[PDB]
Specification:
Helices cover about 40% and strands about 20% of the residues. By secondary structure, the protein is an alpha/beta fold. It has a five-stranded parallel β-sheet with strand order 2-1-3-4-5, with helices on both faces. Bound molecules: magnesium ion (MG). Magnesium ion binds near residues 11, 12, 56, 58 and 59. The PDB classes it as signaling protein. The entry lists the keywords Spo0A, Paenisporosarcina sp. TG-14, signaling protein. It forms a monomeric assembly.
């Protein structure tokens, strides 16, 4: 049973806690790191790349679109499927996510299993 490697970057620690637990329990998903802001995920993104990055747009110090733009310029996005997560679903923002190479965009709140199903779409095979 092959595991899709997932990383999470979000500044709501209770969501990161819950979501890491839920995704790990899935047979085809392995959560390999979590970060609470944009700087920390970039530190981690050096050296260690997931198949899927769950990425909150609104974050202290360094936000989701900044991370996405840095990762697109470092050729990370060829491997990494980035799924933007946010309650700020403004139409120009999405457009930026698209230009900066996001695979997907999801609104908070979301059903966990519906997010699982999108992880399997962007990174699952057979
Ligand atoms: Mg946020």
């Amino acid at each position: 049973m092959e595991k899709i490697k997932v990383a999470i970057a979000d500044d709501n620690k209770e969501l990161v806690k819950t979501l890491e637990s839920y995704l790990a329990d899935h047979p085809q998903i392995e959560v390999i790191t979590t970060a609470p802001n944009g700087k920390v995920i970039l530190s981690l993104m050096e050296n260690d790349l997931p198949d899927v990055l769950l990425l909150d747009i609104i974050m202290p110090h360094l936000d989701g679109l900044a991370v996405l733009e840095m990762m697109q310029a470092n050729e990370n996005l060829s491997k990494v499927q980035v799924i933007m997560l946010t309650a700020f679903g403004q139409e120009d923002v999405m457009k930026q996510a698209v230009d900066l190479g996001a695979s997907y965009f999801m609104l908070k709140p979301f059903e966990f299993d519906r997010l699982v199903n999108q992880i399997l779409q962007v990174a699952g095979h057979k």
